[PDB]
Design a protein around this ligand. Structure first.
Ligand SMILES: Nc1ncnc2c1ncn2[C@@H]1O[C@H](COP(=O)(O)OP(=O)(O)OP(O)(O)=S)[C@@H](O)[C@H]1O
Ligand SMILES: Nc1ncnc2c1ncn2[C@@H]1O[C@H](COP(=O)(O)OP(=O)(O)OP(O)(O)=S)[C@@H](O)[C@H]1O
Ligand SMILES: Nc1ncnc2c1ncn2[C@@H]1O[C@H](COP(=O)(O)OP(=O)(O)O)[C@@H](O)[C@H]1O
Ligand SMILES: [Mg+2]
Ligand SMILES: [Mg+2]
Lengths: 261, 325, 174, 348, 546, 261
DNA sequence: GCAGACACTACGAGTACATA
């Protein structure tokens, strides 16, 4: 028996819109610690992890380690019918083949139950190494979304550089290069605007733009964002979503050109 | 000063006196300019004959450098020339007068066969209504892709292929301007392989001079890869004089030794069979078979099998020609 | 559309004859004091092909370029019409005379006409030619088969010669 | 699970036939710098099994854990097309002909995004990913011309195993860029050995006569042989040497269509045969297989001096069918030409 | 002779040698204010020039609205259906059951004149909504709501509104949906609506023909039009014989407006008497008529009845009619579906073979034009119909049917591909990759259905043997592998049947094949119940493992 | 080395929004006197002559004279995400292609370096006649924009006349005519709203309304515009920017033919 | 000073067709 209750309905209504055009399905792993989602995209470029602990739910019942697989083309239409500040309960039986979402109508007069068929998918955990990254930085969330949106009008792919000075975004296209930098934003009143550096070894890697925009579609879930990079490890984009848990994004770099001699 | 330019762009006939061939047409257009009676022109012909150079020389003769941007509107296939462009910038350029100095304006539509027929139908009353204010010049390679209403409104000049007799002095000017050592057989090979096209003549001249340093018949036919006349005569003699296996071995050795292609061999053999006094039933069969072989070479087909079929097309007709007697 | 043609009187203009264009040409010549011969005016009518715009344009071009209208000055700047010469080649292909048909084809080739214009003139002549209807359909099908190859990219003198040879084959294949 | 999927070998050392080719394929993919592969042969020869064996040789046992991923691609006409994809954590499997003439839009946009991106985990996954393009002979030439620079540029980090039936439909630029691996059909003895091994693993006893008849009726298709053997046990467990082997319905319908062609040569019979050919084309039978079955049954009714002309006409109208777009015109033209030729032969 | 035994002396020569080694040598070297169509327009019912049956039917249909509109009980083949629907009665809402009168016909017959005269004759006020209006689905909606849902602003004595919708065949499909939604509000429609179109077979009016009082206009009688043109010419003071007016009526294809406009141009005031050569000339009065599909197929397949006897004039006439009809693909489909149904005189099938060669020629031209973007190749397939006219022209009367075989085949093929996708998407991806859907269809469908149907006796599971239990377990395992099941379906006869959920028998089976024994109802019900039981047991085993 | 410094970003935004639908590409002619830009439109009917003085910039250095041809849609996309109160640096090297626009975010924290690639247009210099005009009118720019917008509703081509009385506008359209005549409006408290007549000979000329409406978009640059008209020289719309420079718009008259009658 | 309403153009989207 899986029976969970949310404290805010805006968490799903901000976390499923980033996964609407990014991943084709949502696979939830049920455990006593919490719910874990690890989904790789169809092009094998992006990897989405979402760990919501059991301490953040209003209530949480889990007896067996179960895995549920739901689609996105129906859950995205179901989520738009739901409200914003209401409560969402997720229900799943031991032997049934459906997942029930029970919430309140936006008219706030009746309870709405929606059932989704459980897709039996055969996946395996890829396994993140959780190694020491050569660069860790902290950035504002909405500022990072505006940065990723401003490079969309220039080039189809972006270049992320990270020395000890800060984080440099570059966009080289047929129009011309767009280079922006953020450095030393500790002298502000808001704690979420602190652009800080945490590691030493500089890294320069070219990533895609569409997947970064899909990553920045989940910006008002958290206050700050974290970016981790290394010489060959994919880019890690970390959101600390309130108290119930956190989300990780893995984006593979592009193949570098033959600039040798 | 010197510039890094191709010889088809470094040597462009900036004036009308530097073009070589179409002397009556150029004299008529020069008298159009001098009498101030320039009509809407339609320049059509094969590529590399000097239509764009003609209209650019006429535009440079008609207008000065201080006013050239306000009098000439030049549009080609690299620009958008839809019906919104005809109703937009072209109609506003036609319906308004000049800025700096008085004069009639010039709309050049290079590669006018690439225009849509909606745009060509919108062009008709723009050309007819503003004849006194602006002039139109259409340039095309295919006259059938221009509507007959636009062909009525313009006086058409056929810029035919350049004859090799008038083609020689311009090539000699380019040779003397570039310090190129060329023989008479090299110039003959240039005007033969160009086939009424100064672009490919200058391109083959520049390629041969860069590849070998001299321009002779051997260097031109080696840089181009074209077979010589003696090679084609040998191929025809082998196909008409001996059996399948010996002719196949000789033609295969000639193609492997000199690196010949079957398209040029087919072209020269097709030029040869109209010179050889064949019977009419033999000639029809040869033309049909060679057209089939040339059509088969346009896709991913093995060239050895097509060479064997080329030998086969004459080995069929050998007995027929001899038994005709 | 047919409602608009029903709502209006449909007047149909026919192509102008030689004397009708000749009267207007005489009026323009007497207005402009253009010297001429009768052969030059006949050449202007020949290049006009029923078009008064082309007649006036060719007369203006010849008078500006040379100042006199005879046959040589007209034909130095203007051009003889295409389908009257294409019709002789089609007549030679009807009688399976490949040599004269190739002579006309090579003359049209050395004048700089593209294969698409030549095959368009060949089709336009073969639409209204005076021969057997089944032979006309065989000719039109062979012309379309060759024109597909022209549109594909293979457009040489050998391809047009093969079209002429196939049209001569269609005669002697009952 | 059927017998075609229950006893399929997993590794290259477990194959029952083409064992020398299996050892050569093991030696080829050991270093990791093996080129693009073009696995070709008749249908049911074992090409897909050997492709999955090569994949299991390159990667771990996680290659067999597969999933369905749907990708939406925008055409240049801005009509969105959804295409399915068999995927794993190490390889990808695309059949672009499911997008029809939009297959090039699969190659130009969906494939390059696979090729331009490196692997997330270079420890579990290798330095390269493998993309299996299934039925590349059904690709249009535009998709094959879009394939070649993607194959050349990203060969070091993205390998391709193209699979087809005939390499004649593959353009020479693609065939120049890949190593052609030929998988012939197993012989009658090999199919008898495979069927005997499957029956003994199932606890059943299979005679040599029934195994030989299944191998001969299968036309050296091991998939169809295993399906026919399973249908034979189902319908009658005591295996008689003269037990009736079941047959597919479209083959019998094609045989009766050819018998109807032979029986009468009249425009009304041509109308009835055209109705039968629409019935065959409606059931998604490919028109080349209709042509092959029509030839294979019409040559059984012709005399010795007509079969070459019938075969040449069948090849000619098959070529015209491939050059065209409406198959019923060329199929009915072949039937009408055969009717005219057969009437001329019978009356004279 | 082009071949000489002796070698030439002066000119260059090319040798030719045979296989037998013989040498040969070749040579190498207010009367003046208005139109006559408006001056002679009918202002009453007695001056109409249409068919009397259609006028009476439209007047009776409009007088069927007299009870609902005017509040009075008393007002004062193709023919048989109209006379039945005029006498079919009324719905219990005191209205006709056909609330819309759709008027169809070729141009220039008098449809707008008939609608306006019949509406003003029955006491209505004509409200017109033609193609010169905006015709957007909201403007169309509010104009119909204005025209039909309110009374008169003049109070008592104001005439009711009869909404005449001219040129409805050019309206979009959403406008027709708006009109039908207003027509089917049960908001009740209290006023008549009459629609006028030119082509009844428009794709936007296909739902309208099933709901409208369909009035099709025949062409006008030549004697009536000749008498009316005589009246017009005598009123205008111009003399003309009935023969030249009959020739003019023949030329304009019984168009009243075109004939009167042609007379207005040709008369003028320079001359009084009309000449036959003016009508026979093509300079004045000849307009392009869009030919129907069936008329084009009839003039292709059937020779004209006995100048016009030359084959070249028939060639050009058939070519120009097939060009002027338009809708080239439908003409080709009609030729393909009708040319084998004729009484063909070619018993050697050569004409059929060259007709199929011409059809393949058209198909190749369409493919090449749509591949290379070279549409100048689209001038040859107009010679496809006239080729049929050279091949299959007969003096008989062929029954030309409308083509449906290609479209039915394409729709059935689309249904089969959708069913193939539905079958393929149900299977597991571990076994989906092992076979392509084409190979699964050709190899693994009929044999799979033979596997799925064993000889099973109608015996319960407790009395089955161990081997039969193992066979049933293997059967439900391979049934669950492909995600197939049997489900109940109702029949009009009242008997429940069991059908496979992905119904793959239409993929497998063929019509004229010999029949095979199906499973009975009891064993199929047992199979479905065992499938459900095995699904629940599989879920329980998965819960026990996890 | 070229380095100009716009003191605020609003003037460049107004300039590049005035020319956006009119000018194909921007030819910045650079000297020690300032920045000049003489560019025709795509239809070769209008002409734009913008002159920015060196004293109007914050810092302006120019060693050798340049002529930078750059695209305008790219510069429009660059200047769209630019503030109105921030300094904007224009940088260019001697033999490079990067024209650099360096500014700050509207958040006023991070830098933004947008490069553009210079074009090679080598267009010939168009000679401004700089002769005297037979009519010079000082009028407010907002009133000129309002009267052009009001005349765009009636017709498409507008006959503008000027005499000793004042400027007169006529639009003979399909609805009818609109004749608006304004004169001697200097008797207000404002100084910008005034109509002044300087020169003598009356002129009547017809112009397209589209180019006039494009010219009126420079209204926030200058409060008062100048109209210069004569029988031969074109129509000049002169905006005098307060402490940066000036902007001249040249529009050619349309060809009008009288009735034969 | 800031929320509601008005028309304005840019942009997404569907459909037809392309010959003599
Ligand atoms: N008559 C000529 N006299 C001298 N040089 C010529 C002549 N015709 C062509 N050329 C050379 O060929 C170059 C290109 O010729 P063009 O004027 O572009 O011919 P074109 O007729 O415009 O060919 P197309 O139809 O546009 S591809 C010129 O720059 C010259 O170098
Ligand atoms: N009895 C008549 N005598 C003379 N003229 C008539 C008579 N009846 C109608 N007409 C005129 O002939 C024309 C008939 O066409 P209309 O009824 O107006 O339009 P229509 O018949 O619906 O054909 P379309 O499809 O709209 S072109 C009109 O110009 C009428 O004035
Ligand atoms: N070496 C083998 N031993 C046993 N069975 C095999 C072997 N190779 C292939 N098969 C069986 O034969 C069938 C061949 O199908 P497949 O592997 O898809 O080849 P193809 O791609 O040529 O159709 C498969 O279903 C497989 O189970
Ligand atoms: Mg050119
Ligand atoms: Mg009407």
């Amino acid at each position: 028996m899986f029976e969970a209750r949310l404290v805010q309905g805006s968490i799903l209504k901000k976390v499923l819109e980033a996964l609407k055009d990014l991943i084709n399905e949502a696979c939830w792993d049920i455990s006593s610690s919490g719910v874990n989602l690890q989904s790789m995209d169809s092009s094998h470029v992006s990897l989405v992890q979402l760990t919501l602990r059991s301490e953040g739910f209003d209530t949480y019942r889990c007896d067996r380690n179960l895995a549920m697989g739901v689609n996105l083309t129906s859950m995205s239409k179901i989520l738009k019918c739901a409200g914003n500040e209401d409560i969402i309960t997720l229900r799943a039986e031991d032997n049934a083949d459906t997942l029930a979402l029970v919430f309140e109508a936006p008219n706030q007069e009746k309870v709405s139950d929606y059932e989704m068929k459980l897709m039996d998918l055969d996946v395996e955990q890829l396994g993140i190494p959780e190694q020491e990254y050569s660069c860790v930085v902290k950035m504002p969330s909405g500022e990072f979304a505006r940065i990723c949106r401003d490079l969309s009008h220039i080039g189809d792919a972006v270049v992320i550089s990270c020395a000890k000075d800060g984080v440099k975004f570059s966009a080289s296209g047929e129009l011309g290069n767009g280079n922006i930098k953020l450095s030393q934003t500790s002298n502000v009143d808001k704690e979420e605007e602190a652009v800080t550096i945490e590691m030493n070894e500089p890294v320069q890697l070219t990533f895609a733009l569409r997947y970064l925009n899909f990553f920045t579609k989940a910006t008002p879930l958290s206050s700050t964002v974290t970016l981790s990079m290394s010489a060959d490890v994919p880019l890690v984009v970390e959101y600390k979503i309130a108290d119930m848990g956190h989300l990780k994004y893995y984006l593979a770099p592009k193949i570098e050109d033959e600039e040798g001699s | 000063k010197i510039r890094n330019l191709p010889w088809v762009e470094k040597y462009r006939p900036q004036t009308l006196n530097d073009l070589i061939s179409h002397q009556d047409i150029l004299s008529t257009i020069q008298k159009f300019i001098n009498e101030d009676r320039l009509p809407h022109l339609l320049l059509y012909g094969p590529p590399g004959t000097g239509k764009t150079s003609t209209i650019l020389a006429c535009a440079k003769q008609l207008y000065k450098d201080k006013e050239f941007g306000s009098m000439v509107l030049e549009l080609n296939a690299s620009d958008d020339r839809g019906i919104d462009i005809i109703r937009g910038p072209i109609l506003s350029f036609a319906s308004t007068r000049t800025i700096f100095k008085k004069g009639f304006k010039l709309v050049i539509l290079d590669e006018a066969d690439a225009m849509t027929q909606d745009a060509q139908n919108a062009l008709r009353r723009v050309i007819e209504k503003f004849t006194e204010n602006t002039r139109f010049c259409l340039i095309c390679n295919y006259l059938s892709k221009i509507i007959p209403a636009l062909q009525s409104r313009c006086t058409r000049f056929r810029f035919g292929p350049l004859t090799p007799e008038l083609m020689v002095p311009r090539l000699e000017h380019v040779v003397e301007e570039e310090k190129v050592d060329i023989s008479e057989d090299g110039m003959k090979a240039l005007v033969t392989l160009s086939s009424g096209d100064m672009r490919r003549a200058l391109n083959i001249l520049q390629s041969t001079n860069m590849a070998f340093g001299k321009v002779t018949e051997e260097t031109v036919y080696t840089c181009t890869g074209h077979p010589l006349k003696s090679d084609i005569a040998n191929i025809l003699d082998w196909m008409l004089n001996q059996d399948f296996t010996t002719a196949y071995r000789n033609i295969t050795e000639l193609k492997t030794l000199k690196g010949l292609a079957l398209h040029d061999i087919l072209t020269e053999i097709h030029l040869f069979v109209h010179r050889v006094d064949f019977p009419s039933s033999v000639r029809i069969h040869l033309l049909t078979k060679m057209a089939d072989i040339e059509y088969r070479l346009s896709v991913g087909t093995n060239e050895k099998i097509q060479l064997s079929s080329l030998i086969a097309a004459f080995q069929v007709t050998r007995d027929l020609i001899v038994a005709e007697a | 559309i047919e409602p608009i043609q029903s709502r209006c009187a449909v007047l149909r203009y026919t192509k102008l004859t030689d004397a009708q264009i000749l009267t207007r040409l005489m009026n323009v010549i007497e207005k402009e004091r253009v010297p001429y011969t009768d052969d030059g005016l006949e050449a202007i009518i020949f290049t006009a092909q029923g078009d008064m715009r082309q007649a006036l344009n060719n007369l203006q071009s010849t008078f500006s370029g040379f100042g006199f209208i005879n046959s040589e000055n007209v034909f130095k700047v203007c051009d003889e019409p295409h389908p009257l010469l294409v019709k002789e080649m089609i007549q030679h292909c009807v009688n399976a005379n490949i040599d004269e048909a190739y002579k006309i084809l090579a003359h049209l080739w050395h004048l700089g006409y593209s294969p698409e214009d030549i095959i368009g003139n060949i089709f336009r002549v073969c639409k209204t030619f005076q021969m057997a209807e089944y032979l006309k359909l065989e000719f039109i099908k062979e012309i379309g088969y060759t024109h597909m190859k022209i549109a594909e990219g293979v457009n040489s003198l050998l391809q047009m010669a093969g079209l002429l040879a196939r049209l001569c084959q269609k005669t002697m294949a009952p | 699970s059927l017998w075609v999927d229950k006893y399929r070998p997993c590794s290259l050392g477990r194959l029952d036939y083409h064992k020398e080719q299996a050892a050569q394929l093991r030696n080829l993919v050991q270093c990791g710098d093996f080129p693009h592969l073009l696995v070709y042969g008749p249908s049911g020869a074992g090409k897909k099994t050997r492709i999955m064996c090569i994949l299991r040789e390159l990667y771990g046992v996680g290659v067999e854990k597969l999933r369905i991923e749907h990708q939406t691609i925008t055409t240049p006409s801005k009509k969105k097309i959804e295409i399915s994809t068999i995927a794993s954590n190490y390889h990808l499997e695309v059949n672009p002909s499911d997008a029809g003439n939009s297959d090039r839009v699969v190659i130009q946009e969906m494939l390059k995004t696979v090729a331009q991106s490196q692997q997330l985990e270079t420890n579990s996954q290798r330095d390269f990913k493998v993309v299996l393009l299934t039925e590349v002979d059904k690709l249009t030439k535009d998709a094959q011309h879009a394939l070649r620079r993607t194959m050349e540029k990203y060969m070091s980090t993205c390998r391709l195993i193209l699979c087809c039936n005939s390499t004649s439909k593959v353009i020479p630029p693609i065939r120049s860029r890949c190593l052609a691996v030929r998988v012939p059909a197993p012989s009658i003895e090999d199919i008898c050995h495979v069927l005997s091994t499957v029956c003994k693993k199932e606890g059943l006893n299979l005679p040599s006569q029934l195994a030989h008849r299944l191998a001969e009726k299968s036309c050296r298709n091991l998939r169809k042989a295993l399906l026919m053997c399973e249908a034979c046990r189902v319908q009658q467990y005591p295996f008689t040497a003269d037990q009736e082997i079941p047959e597919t319905d479209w083959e019998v319908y094609l045989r009766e269509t050819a018998n109807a062609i032979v029986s009468q040569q009249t425009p009304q019979r041509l109308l009835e045969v055209r109705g039968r050919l629409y019935e065959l084309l409606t059931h998604c039978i490919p028109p080349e297989i209709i042509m092959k079955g029509l030839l294979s049954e019409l040559l059984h009714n012709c005399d010795g001096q007509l079969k070459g002309e019938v075969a040449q006409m069948a090849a000619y109208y098959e070529h015209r069918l491939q050059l065209g777009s409406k198959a019923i015109y060329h199929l009915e033209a072949f039937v009408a030409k055969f009717m005219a030729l057969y009437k001329k032969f019978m009356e004279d | 002779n082009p071949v000489l035994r002796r070698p030439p002396i002066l000119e260059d020569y090319v040798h030719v040698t045979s296989t037998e080694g013989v040498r040969a040598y070749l040579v190498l070297r207010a009367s003046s204010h208005c139109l006559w169509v408006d001056e002679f327009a009918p202002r009453h019912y007695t001056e109409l020039l249409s068919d009397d049956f259609t006028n009476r039917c439209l007047l009776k249909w409009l007088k069927l609205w007299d009870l609902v509109v005017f509040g009075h009980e008393r007002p004062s083949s193709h023919e048989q259906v109209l006379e039945e629907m005029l006498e079919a009665g009324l719905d219990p809402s005191q209205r006709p059951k056909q609330k819309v009168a759709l008027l169809c016909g070729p141009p220039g017959l008098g449809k707008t004149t008939l609608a306006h005269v019949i509406a003003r004759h029955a006491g209505y006020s004509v409200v017109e909504m033609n193609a010169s209006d905006d015709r957007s689905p909201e403007v169309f909606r509010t104009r119909i709501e204005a025209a039909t849902q309110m009374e008169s602003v003049l109070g008592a004595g104001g005439k009711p509104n009869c909404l005449v919708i001219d040129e409805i065949d050019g309206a979009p499909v959403a406008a027709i949906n708006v009109l039908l939604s207003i027509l089917n509000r049960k908001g009740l429609l209290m006023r008549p609506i009459i629609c006028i179109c030119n082509d009844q077979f428009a794709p936007s009016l296909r739902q309208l023909k099933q709901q409208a009082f369909l009035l099709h206009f025949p062409p006008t009688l030549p004697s009536r039009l000749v008498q009316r043109l005589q009246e017009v010419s005598l009123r205008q003071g111009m003399r003309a014989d009935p023969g030249v007016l009959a020739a003019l009526c023949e030329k304009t294809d019984n168009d009243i407006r075109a004939c009167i406009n042609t007379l207005q141009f040709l008369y003028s005031r320079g001359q009084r008497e009309l000449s036959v050569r003016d009508v026979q000339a093509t300079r004045v009065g000849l307009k392009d008529q869009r030919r129907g599909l069936f008329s084009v197929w009839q003039e292709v397949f059937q020779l004209p009845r006995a100048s016009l006897t030359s084959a070249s004039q028939r060639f050009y006439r058939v070519l120009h009619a097939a060009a002027s009809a338009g809708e080239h693909e439908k003409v080709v489909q009609g030729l393909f579906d009708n040319f084998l149904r004729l009484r063909l005189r070619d018993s050697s099938l050569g004409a059929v073979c060259v007709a199929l060669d011409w059809l393949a020629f058209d198909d190749l031209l369409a493919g090449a034009a749509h591949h290379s973007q070279s549409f100048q190749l689209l001038r040859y397939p107009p010679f496809l119909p006239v080729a049929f006219h050279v091949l299959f022209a007969s003096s008989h009367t062929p029954r030309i049917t409308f083509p449906s075989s290609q479209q039915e085949a394409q729709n059935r093929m689309s249904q089969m591909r959708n069913l193939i996708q539905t079958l393929v998407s149900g299977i597991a991806p571990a076994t989906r990759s092992r076979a392509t859907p084409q190979a699964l269809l050709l190899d693994a469908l009929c044999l799979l259905l033979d596997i799925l149907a064993p000889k099973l006796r109608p015996v319960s599971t407790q009395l089955y043997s161990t081997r039969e239990k193992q066979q049933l377990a293997s059967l439900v395992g391979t049934m669950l592998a492909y995600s197939l099941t049997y489900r109940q379906e109702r029949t009009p006869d009242g008997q429940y049947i069991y059908r496979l959920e992905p119904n793959v028998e239409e993929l497998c089976r063929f019509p004229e094949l010999p029949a095979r024994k199906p499973l009975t109802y009891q064993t199929k019900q047992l199979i479905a119940r065992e499938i459900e039981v095995e699904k629940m047991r599989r879920a329980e085993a998965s819960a026990r493992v996890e």
